[PDB]
């Protein structure tokens, strides 16, 4: 059971050094790549991400593709440079320009032939693929313009396996570049169709965690990307160890997705507290779940209280039994009858992994599916609306060769993705 990992883009690069650092520490690998086992769980399921080599040397399934040749040297010539086969590392010369219409016009047309060729032997050298991760961004060009074209090949290539993309979202307020309403919705056009699902993450929401819970007002991006690697590990936590139930990446997506259009999700994590709030916190299974339904613990700034939960999958790392979970959720589904969908009854999935984390007693990885996500999209389209009617910031896309009316196709795709959620945010049928 292997999956294929892609870090397409600059944000793909700096999440991956945050990703694989907490994965290699989780199975007991060092910072170099040699093995140091704790018990048999770390001996048998290193067959999830890692291909073998001579001795106890392990190589992760990864391709890390960028167009900007600078920041790849921060992980190649930088630390963990002995933990990637440099044939897998592949990157051109010219920068994108924070342009969707350039990473999908010309640069993918000059790398994604040779990028996909490296993906060939990584896929063939396992027995059974499971998923195909392409954790990227939507803001800049490389993570988006290649992030769609490298996506759209694989559905034409491997029409069976699954897609788990962790594309980060632009912010309604704290946005970072100026091409964000164009560089999102073009990528949102390709990502609704070909991707199986995605997990949105917004930085403006992520800043609210450190400003309310951990009480740090001066973090770093390297500190911030360190936090998302919880739920990166949190998804395949149920599989990489001896579990008790419902252990698969597929067992999530077969019943987290009611219709094959919506596919989008909200992410929460628990517990987390500063060193001042450390010991005074207790670690209880009812005490965790009350954190997981707060709007101060989500990774997208849309209010979940404002919407309704279609589906909820709870994935727990540690020592936790069955009705410990549910009996607190019983009181939750009484206090929140305006928050649960009625026409889909019994909307709670649960998943228990029987291995604790490091330096923790229990943990709770949360997957949510609100109807609040259309509001960010309506926020995104409203940002799109004033940007397009003037047709400013335009000829750096058509000048590369994308059609003018092709945007209106994407907005019509974008608007329709918004337009399915208003059935269900007010749903008595």
């Amino acid at each position: 059971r292997e999956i294929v990992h892609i870090q397409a883009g600059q944000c793909g690069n700096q999440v991956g050094a945050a990703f694989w650092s907490t994965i290699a520490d989780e199975h007991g690998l060092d910072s170099a790549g040699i093995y140091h086992g704790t018990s048999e769980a770390q001996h048998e399921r290193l067959n999830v991400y890692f291909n073998e080599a001579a001795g106890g040397k392990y190589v992760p399934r990864a391709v890390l593709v960028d167009l900007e040749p600078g920041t790849m040297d921060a992980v190649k010539s930088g630390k963990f440079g002995n933990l990637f086969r440099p044939d897998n590392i592949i990157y051109g010369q010219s920068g994108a320009g924070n342009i969707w219409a350039k990473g999908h016009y010309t640069e993918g047309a000059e790398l994604a032939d040779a990028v996909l060729d490296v993906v060939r032997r990584e896929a063939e050298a396992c027995d059974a693929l499971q998923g195909f991760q392409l954790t990227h961004s939507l803001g800049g060009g490389t993570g988006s313009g290649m992030g769609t074209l490298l996506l759209s090949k694989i559905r034409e290539e491997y029409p069976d396996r699954m897609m788990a993309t962790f594309s980060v979202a632009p912010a309604p307020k704290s946005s970072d570049t100026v091409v964000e309403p164009y560089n999102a919705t073009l990528s949102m056009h390709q990502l609704v169709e070909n991707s199986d699902e995605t997990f949105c993450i917004d930085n403006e929401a992520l800043s609210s965690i450190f400003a309310n819970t951990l009480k740090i007002k001066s973090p770093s991006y390297d500190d911030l990307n360190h936090l998302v690697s919880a739920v990166m590990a949190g998804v395949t936590t149920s599989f990489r160890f001896p579990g008790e139930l419902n252990s698969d990446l597929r067992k999530l997506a077969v019943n987290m997705v009611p219709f094959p259009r919506l596919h989008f999700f909200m992410v929460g994590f628990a517990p987390l507290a500063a060193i001042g709030s450390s010991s005074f916190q207790a670690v209880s299974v009812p005490e965790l779940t009350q954190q997981m339904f707060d709007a101060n613990n989500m990774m997208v700034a849309a209010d979940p209280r404002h919407g309704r939960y279609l589906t909820v999958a709870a994935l727990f790392r540690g020592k936790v039994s069955m009705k410990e979970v549910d009996e607190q959720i019983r009181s939750v589904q009484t206090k929140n009858s305006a928050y649960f969908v009625e026409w889909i009854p019994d909307n709670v999935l649960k998943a228990v992994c029987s291995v604790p984390p490091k330096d923790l007693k229990m943990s709770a990885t949360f997957i949510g599916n609100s109807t609040s996500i259309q509001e960010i999209f309506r926020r995104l389209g409203d940002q799109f609306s004033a940007m397009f009617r003037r047709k400013a910031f335009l000829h750096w896309y058509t000048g590369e060769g994308m059609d003018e009316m092709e945007f209106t196709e994407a907005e019509s795709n974008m608007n329709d993705l918004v337009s399915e959620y208003q059935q269900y945010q007010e749903a008595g049928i």
């Binding site: 029409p159 069976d160 094959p260 259009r261 196709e409 019509s412 329709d416 049928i429």
Partner: protein, 344 residues
């Protein structure tokens, strides 16, 4: 008028000698005089008699081409000459006759005409026939391609060319869902209709089931552009593939694509009319490429006909009656026929 005009007809196939003489199949369909509600029963003088389904034109294993064609297609052939878009498509279980319904025979006796050739070669000539004697200028174009696993292959050309990016909308109308990146061809007469459709219908992917060696898997779609004179009414002749069961295919992973993804869009064809029994706050037309194209067809500005070809042999009771609820539920939806003289 502006009524609830949605045309639905049912014509079952005929049993063979080995089937019912072994199986003693259902007694659910009549000899097919006119459309009337029959029954749902098996072991009829016993405790399985449930209900009937109200019909428009039920026909048993008795109906022929010109019995159907003069009453179903021909009152809408005049609507095409009247300047209106029309839509005709068939549906049913696999191996029942819905490929026979659109394109039936390849006899093609080119002295005069063919016999039993299906609705499209009857609607081919009988639009070229009446157009020859109505004292106006005419120009005829067509485009014939297929739909297969969320992909489009041009059945007009055998070359390996496809769409550049995506299916396009327009800012002119809402009912347009235009498909560029694909060729339409010019047609002079009735003698050029079958001339391109012959090799054109051969370009599709006729797979082989355990049941039939002819029950294909693609979605044949036959579009017509009529530039008579200044005006143009597009006409949709659409084939649909079958609702394939699990065990009656022998399908491996190469066959499961044209099993699963085909049934994926046929299920999608369910909810796009299951949401029109009450027409709530969203109409999910954009779920697959089969229903984006039929957006102006299904409940839109276009007159729409529908064929439900089922099997009367007891190969099932699962979707023996389940497929007839599609015409039964979504009968009562309305449209709006609009005129087309394109002002230059």
């Amino acid at each position: 008028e502006n009524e609830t005009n949605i045309n639905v007809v049912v014509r079952v196939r005929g049993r063979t000698d080995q089937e019912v003489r072994d199986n003693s199949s259902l007694a659910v369909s009549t000899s097919g005089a006119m459309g009337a509600e029959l029954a749902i029963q098996s072991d009829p003088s016993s405790m399985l008699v449930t209900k009937t389904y109200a019909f428009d034109k039920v026909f048993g294993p008795e109906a022929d081409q010109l019995m159907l064609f003069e009453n179903s297609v021909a009152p809408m052939l005049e609507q095409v000459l009247n300047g209106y878009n029309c839509t005709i498509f068939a549906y049913g279980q696999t191996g029942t006759g819905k490929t026979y319904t659109m394109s039936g025979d390849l006899s093609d006796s080119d002295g005069i005409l063919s016999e039993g050739a299906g609705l499209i070669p009857r609607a081919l000539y009988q639009l070229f026939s009446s157009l020859d004697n109505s004292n106006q200028e005419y120009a005829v174009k067509c485009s014939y391609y297929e739909l297969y696993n969320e992909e489009i292959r041009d059945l007009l050309v055998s070359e390996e060319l496809r769409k550049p990016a995506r299916v396009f909308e327009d800012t002119s109308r809402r009912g347009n869902v235009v498909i560029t990146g694909i060729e339409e061809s010019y047609i002079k007469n009735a003698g050029d209709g079958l001339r391109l459709l012959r090799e054109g219908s051969h370009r599709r992917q006729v797979a082989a089931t355990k049941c039939n060696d002819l029950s294909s898997r693609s979605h044949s779609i036959f579009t017509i552009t009529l530039h008579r004179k200044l005006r143009a009414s597009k006409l949709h002749m659409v084939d649909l593939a079958g609702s394939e069961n699990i065990g009656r295919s022998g399908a491996e992973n190469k066959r499961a694509r044209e099993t699963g993804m085909i049934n994926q869009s046929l299920l999608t064809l369910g909810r796009v009319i299951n949401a029109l029994v009450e027409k709530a706050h969203h109409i999910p037309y954009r779920e697959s490429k089969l229903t984006r194209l039929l957006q102006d067809s299904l409940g839109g500005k276009t007159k729409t006909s529908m064929i439900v070809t089922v099997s009367s042999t007891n190969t099932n009771l699962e979707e023996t009656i389940s497929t007839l609820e599609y015409a039964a539920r979504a009968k009562s939806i309305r449209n709006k026929p609009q005129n087309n003289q394109l002002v230059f």
